[PDB]
Amino acid sequence: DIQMTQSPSSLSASLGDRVTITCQASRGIGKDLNWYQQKAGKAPKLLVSDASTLEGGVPSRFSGSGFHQDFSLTISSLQAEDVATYFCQQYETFGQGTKVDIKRTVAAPSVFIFPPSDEQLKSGTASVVCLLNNFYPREAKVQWKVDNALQSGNSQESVTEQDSKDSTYSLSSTLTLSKADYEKHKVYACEVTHQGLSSPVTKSFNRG
Amino acid sequence: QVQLVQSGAAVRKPGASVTVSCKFAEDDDAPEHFIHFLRQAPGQQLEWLAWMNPTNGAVNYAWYLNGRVTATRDRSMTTAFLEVKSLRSDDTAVYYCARAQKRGRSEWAYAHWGQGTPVVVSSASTKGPSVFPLAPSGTAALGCLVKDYFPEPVTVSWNSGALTSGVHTFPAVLQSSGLYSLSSVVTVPSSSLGTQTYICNVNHKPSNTKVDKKVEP
Amino acid sequence: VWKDADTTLFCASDAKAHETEVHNVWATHACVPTDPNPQEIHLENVTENFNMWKNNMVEQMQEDVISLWDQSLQPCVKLTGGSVIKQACPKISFDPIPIHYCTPAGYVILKCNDKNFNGTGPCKNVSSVQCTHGIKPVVSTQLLLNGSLAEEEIIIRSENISDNAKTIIVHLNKSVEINCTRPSNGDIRKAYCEINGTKWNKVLKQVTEKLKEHFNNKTIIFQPPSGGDLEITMHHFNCRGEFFYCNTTQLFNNTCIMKGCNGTITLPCKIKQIINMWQGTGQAMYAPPIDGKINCVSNITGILLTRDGGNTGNNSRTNETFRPGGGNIKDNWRSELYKYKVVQI
Ligand SMILES: *[C@@H]1O[C@H](CO)[C@@H](O)[C@H](O)[C@H]1NC(C)=O
Numbered sequence: 001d002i003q004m005t006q007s008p009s010s011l012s013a014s015l016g017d018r019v020t021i022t023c024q025a026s027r028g029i030g031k032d033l034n035w036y037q038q039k040a041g042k043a044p045k046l047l048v049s050d051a052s053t054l055e056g057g058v059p060s061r062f063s064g065s066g067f068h069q070d071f072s073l074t075i076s077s078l079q080a081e082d083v084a085t086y087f088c089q090q091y092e093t094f095g096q097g098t099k100v101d102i103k104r105t106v107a108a109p110s111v112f113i114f115p116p117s118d119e120q121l122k123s124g125t126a127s128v129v130c131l132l133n134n135f136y137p138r139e140a141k142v143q144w145k146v147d148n149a150l151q152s153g154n155s156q157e158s159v160t161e162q163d164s165k166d167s168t169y170s171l172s173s174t175l176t177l178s179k180a181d182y183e184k185h186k187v188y189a190c191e192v193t194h195q196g197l198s199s200p201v202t203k204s205f206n207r208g
Numbered sequence: 209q210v211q212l213v214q215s216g217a218a219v220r221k222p223g224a225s226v227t228v229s230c231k232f233a234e235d236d237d238a239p240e241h242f243i244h245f246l247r248q249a250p251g252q253q254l255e256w257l258a259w260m261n262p263t264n265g266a267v268n269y270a271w272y273l274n275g276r277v278t279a280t281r282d283r284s285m286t287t288a289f290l291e292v293k294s295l296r297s298d299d300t301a302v303y304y305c306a307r308a309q310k311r312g313r314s315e316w317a318y319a320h321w322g323q324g325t326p327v328v329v330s331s332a333s334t335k336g337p338s339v340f341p342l343a344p345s346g347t348a349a350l351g352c353l354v355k356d357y358f359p360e361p362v363t364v365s366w367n368s369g370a371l372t373s374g375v376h377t378f379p380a381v382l383q384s385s386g387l388y389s390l391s392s393v394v395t396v397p398s399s400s401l402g403t404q405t406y407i408c409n410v411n412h413k414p415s416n417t418k419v420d421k422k423v424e425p
Numbered sequence: 426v427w428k429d430a431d432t433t434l435f436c437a438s439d440a441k442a443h444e445t446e447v448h449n450v451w452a453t454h455a456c457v458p459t460d461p462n463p464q465e466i467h468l469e470n471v472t473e474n475f476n477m478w479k480n481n482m483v484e485q486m487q488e489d490v491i492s493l494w495d496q497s498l499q500p501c502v503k504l505t506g507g508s509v510i511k512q513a514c515p516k517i518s519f520d521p522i523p524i525h526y527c528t529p530a531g532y533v534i535l536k537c538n539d540k541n542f543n544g545t546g547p548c549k550n551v552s553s554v555q556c557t558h559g560i561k562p563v564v565s566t567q568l569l570l571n572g573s574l575a576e577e578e579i580i581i582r583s584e585n586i587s588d589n590a591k592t593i594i595v596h597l598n599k600s601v602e603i604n605c606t607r608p609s610n611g612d613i614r615k616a617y618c619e620i621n622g623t624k625w626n627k628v629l630k631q632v633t634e635k636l637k638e639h640f641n642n643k644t645i646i647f648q649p650p651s652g653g654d655l656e657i658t659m660h661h662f663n664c665r666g667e668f669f670y671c672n673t674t675q676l677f678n679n680t681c682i683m684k685g686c687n688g689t690i691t692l693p694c695k696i697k698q699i700i701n702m703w704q705g706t707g708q709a710m711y712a713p714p715i716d717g718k719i720n721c722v723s724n725i726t727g728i729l730l731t732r733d734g735g736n737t738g739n740n741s742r743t744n745e746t747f748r749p750g751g752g753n754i755k756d757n758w759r760s761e762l763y764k765y766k767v768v769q770i
């Protein structure tokens with residue numbers, strides 16, 4: 001019946017900066033909208049009930065406003081505790097969510113590459129890891145090369161949560177392939193793209 | 209603002225069922241607010257499942273669940289239970305119990321939350337991880353590859369907790385095999401590589417697996 | 426000029442002081458006689474806002490009926506958490522009588538006379554009275570009995586029709602008789618409730634048609650309760666002091682919207698000795714039924730529904746599902762007190 005169009009899908013902003021996410025409804029819903037905050041790994045937390053009512057234990061910078069069909073949540077001066085996902089709720093219907101984090105000066109990733117252990121090769125499998133350390137924004141593009149042959153569909157990557165102190169992300173990408181398949185090539189590289197990089201960076205090793 | 213208390217994480221084969229419990233009041237201390245159950249699948253939006261009225265067991269289940277879900281409460285009406293039958297892999301999620309604050313009107317403003325109950329639906333068997341070294345090549349990085357375990361979670365400490373200043377333990381990823389992997393990497397100056405031992409301590413409680421891997425150049 | 430306010434109301438009735446029937450006994454000491462000639466004044470050009478879902482009158486009636494029950498009913502045993510109270514459980518005379526609720530000096534009751542008023546919003550035809558009409562405190566689930574009937578069309582009432590946590594009172598504009606009986610001398614607990622299927626399905630049809638108006642135009646479907654205590658999952662009520670539980674499955678048959686659907690519908694009913702107390706927490710045990718024919722002919726004047734939850738597939742489903750509900754007895758009172766609010770002068 002009801003549809004909650006929340007936006008933007010994502011946004012970034014500097015400390016002490018004003019952030020406003022908005023929710024729209026396919027129909028008029030009076031004040032029957034609630035806002036939540038969900039930090040990574042934790043249960044959601046109610047911020048604003050019935051569109052405008054702030055809840056006890058919720059910093060003043062947090063404000064909910066709206067009525068009828070148009071609603072929004074606002075954080076006066078954005079703080080580092082406020083990094084999380086925020087979604088609206090209309091009874092059992094939830095908005096799409098807005099991921100918000102700290103906007104810092106674009107930063108290049110400190111890159112490192114790791115061959116597979118010899119212990120792993122005995123298993124008949126080989127994992128090649130490519131580490132990206134302390135960069136921003138979260139966006140990036142790691143693509144594996146085996147003898148200058150881009151690999152795709154055999155890699156899995158994993159990012160951390162934005163560090164609190166420095167406000168950076170770090171990313172681990174694993175290229176997996178069989179023991180026998182690994183021994184067929186020599187040059188193994190991580191091709192990396194990012195705002196903080198003037199040119200796509202390569203980090204490689206020669207098998208053995 | 210009090211957190212409700214939910215039962216521990218659960219693992220299930222497809223076709224099976226699980227029951228999550230949620231203690232929402234003390235037995236010993238306005239119609240009561242209903243207990244709501246929801247779940248959030250990994251990297252997904254929260255999904256409402258049902259409410260249960262602890263006063264008379266009245267219930268409302270999300271229609272698309274097709275009668276697969278059942279909610280009840282104990283005799284004292286201090287604890288709610290959610291039963292999910294005919295589990296499929298995509299029932300894998302964290303299950304939450306939630307409830308509105310008692311001095312509020314909206315049944316839907318979830319002020320109180322359980323800490324959540326991870327439910328993993330998979331046909332993979334319990335398995336301890338193998339831990340392979342990530343040998344470091346001014347500042348060098350080194351880590352551990354925690355490979356092929358089930359189910360989550362594993363916890364990773366460096367030097368029996370000693371050092372954390374420069375540790376990036378990444379979220380586990382699910383491989384096509386149905387098993388998990390994660391990496392834990394550590395930043396350190398180069399000078400140190402030949403003076404101080406670096407052991408990553410890996411514990412996977414579900415398989416009762418402990419390991420102490422020394423990472424050397 | 427006046428303003429909304431809440432004050433302690435008093436009840437009035439035509440109770441008989443010499444009766445041993447428990448409602449009469451209660452009302453005799455807890456109410457005053459009915460006003461032999463009550464005045465009602467119509468307010469030419471007034472328009473006032475009501476909210477049947479936020480009406481302190483409902484709270485007061487609840488207090489009163491709970492009180493009537495706690496001192497009228499005599500279970501052999503009451504159990505409440507860690508309390509076990511045994512006592513004598515003589516059978517009682519039991520038949521609800523009409524109670525009127527009245528304001529004290531300085532206050533007046535405003536009454537909405539809009540035929541299709543749904544319980545909340547502006548009301549054009551307002552008047553003032555000193556008391557409500559006579560309201561029988563009938564405690565029942567799923568079906569509302571011996572109540573008053575909507576004036577023109579069947580009316581749907583909810584605090585929020587799109588909120589699945591909200592009970593939906595359906596107000597009939599024509600009553601359907603329900604005739605429940607535990608025959609004399611089979612198990613003494615076994616009873617049945619008979620209902621003219623023809624009349625009932627005509628009404629239940631007109632109901633779905635009215636629900637259609639509130640949900641774009643999705644096909645309406647009924648189902649048995651998804652769960653809960655028996656007082657909820659069955660049509661529950663008291664007759665001559667006995668607690669009936671009638672299975673209403675056959676009452677909400679969607680097919681009857683052709684062959685066999687007409688004709689008398691017999692509902693299997695059970696008289697229970699062990700019950701859950703609606704007044705609050707605990708169980709009560711009563712003695713087995715009295716002897717002889719036990720019979721209660723009632724008017725169905727309303728239904729309590731619950732709508733099935735779940736909007737996730739933005740498009741999702743093509744039909745709505747409703748299940749007989751109740752269990753919050755305040756809803757029974759709202760069912761009757763909806764057109765009244767207290768105002769201070
Ligand atoms: C619920 O009802 C109120 C008035 O009683 C109304 O303002 C609001 O729009 C309704 N909520 C929804 C979800 O339609």
Ligand SMILES: *[C@@H]1O[C@H](CO)[C@@H](O)[C@H](O)[C@H]1NC(C)=O
Nearest residue numbers: 543545546547581582583586
């Ligand atoms: C009753 O009528 C009012 C008129 O203002 C309307 O706003 C409200 O939604 C209606 N209630 C229901 C649930 O039909």
Ligand SMILES: *[C@@H]1O[C@H](CO)[C@@H](O)[C@H](O)[C@H]1NC(C)=O
Nearest residue numbers: 577578579580598599631635
């Ligand atoms: C009852 O209500 C329906 C509309 O909801 C109407 O069509 C029908 O004629 C009414 N019946 C009576 C007897 O007023």
Ligand SMILES: *[C@@H]1O[C@H](CO)[C@@H](O)[C@H](O)[C@H]1NC(C)=O
Nearest residue numbers: 602604605606608619720722
């Ligand atoms: C109610 O049903 C009983 C038992 O079938 C019957 O004796 C009695 O005549 C019925 N009463 C009415 C009003 O139809």
Ligand SMILES: *[C@@H]1O[C@H](CO)[C@@H](O)[C@H](O)[C@H]1NC(C)=O
Nearest residue numbers: 621622623624625687688689
């Ligand atoms: C049942 O209801 C119909 C419709 O009002 C009526 O014609 C009939 O007399 C009633 N009795 C029986 C036995 O169907």
Ligand SMILES: *[C@@H]1O[C@H](CO)[C@@H](O)[C@H](O)[C@H]1NC(C)=O
Nearest residue numbers: 634635637638640641642643
């Ligand atoms: C909706 O349903 C009503 C009643 O069945 C019908 O008369 C009408 O054609 C439909 N159109 C709308 C959108 O109300």
Ligand SMILES: *[C@@H]1O[C@H](CO)[C@@H](O)[C@H](O)[C@H]1NC(C)=O
Nearest residue numbers: 649655658659672673674675
């Ligand atoms: C009522 O009767 C039906 C059909 O016999 C049965 O399936 C259902 O379980 C019963 N409902 C209750 C609440 O016992």
Ligand SMILES: *[C@@H]1O[C@H](CO)[C@@H](O)[C@H](O)[C@H]1NC(C)=O
Nearest residue numbers: 674675676678680681683685
């Ligand atoms: C429901 O509909 C069927 C099909 O016409 C009918 O034969 C049956 O008696 C009904 N059952 C109930 C639950 O009343």
Ligand SMILES: *[C@@H]1O[C@H](CO)[C@@H](O)[C@H](O)[C@H]1NC(C)=O
Nearest residue numbers: 563570571662663721722723
């Ligand atoms: C409804 O009223 C009738 C007539 O006064 C009475 O015989 C019957 O017992 C009442 N029903 C209930 C459930 O109180």
